[PDB]
Amino acid sequence: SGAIYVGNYRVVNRHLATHNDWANLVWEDSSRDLLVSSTTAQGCDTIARCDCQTGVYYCSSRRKHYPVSFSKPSLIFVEASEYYPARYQSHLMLAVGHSEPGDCGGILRCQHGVVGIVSTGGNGLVGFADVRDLLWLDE
Ligand SMILES: CSc1c(NC(=O)N2CCC[C@H](C(N)=O)C2)c(C)nn1C
Ligand SMILES: [Zn+2]
C-alpha cells in the first residue's frame, strides 16, 4: 500500500483505489495502473521532472529502502491477476530488486523528487508506474 500526496491530489495504484478515491476521481488509466483522486488537505510531495534512471524505492515487505537502476517508461507485458487480464502496461519501468504482493504503492525517488510508485513484481524484478509526465499534478 501507499500513495503520493501533491497539492490537492492523491495518486494511488488504480487496483488499490478506495470508494472515496472513486467518488472524488480526477483521472484514471487502467493501462498505467494509476488513479488520481482529490483531497481537501494540501500535499507536499515534490514530483521529479527528469529522465533519471537511478533512484531509491521503499520496499514494505523488507521495511527498507533500496537503491536501483531502472529502465525508461515503456509498454511491458503483465500477467493476469484478480485485478486485470493479461495485458501491456504502459509507462512502466523495471529494476532488479525485491518486491512481493503488498509492496505496491511504495515510492521511487531520485534527487529531483518522486518518480513513481511500485506497481508490479516477480522474478527478482520490480516495476514502477511512472508519474513524471503528469505535469498537471503541480497546477
Ligand atoms: C507486487 S510484487 C508481485 C505481484 N504483483 C503484480 O505484479 N501484480 C498484481 C497487482 C496488479 C499489478 C498490475 N500492475 O497489473 C500486477 C505478483 C503477482 N507477484 N509479485 C511478486
Ligand atoms: Zn531525477
UniProtKB/Swiss-Prot annotation:
It comes from the Viruses. Zn(2+) 1 binds at C50, C52, C110, H112. Transmembrane segments: none annotated. The active site is at H15, D33, C104. Cysteine protease that cleaves viral polyprotein and specific host proteins. It is responsible for the autocatalytic cleavage between the P1 and P2 regions, which is the first cleavage occurring in the polyprotein. Also cleaves the host translation initiation factor EIF4G1, in order to shut down the capped cellular mRNA translation. Inhibits the host nucleus-cytoplasm protein and RNA trafficking by cleaving host members of the nuclear pores. Counteracts stress granule formation probably by antagonizing its assembly or promoting its dissassembly. Homodimer. This is Protease 2A. It comes from Coxsackievirus A16 (strain G-10). The chain holds residues 869 to 1007 of 2193 of the full protein.
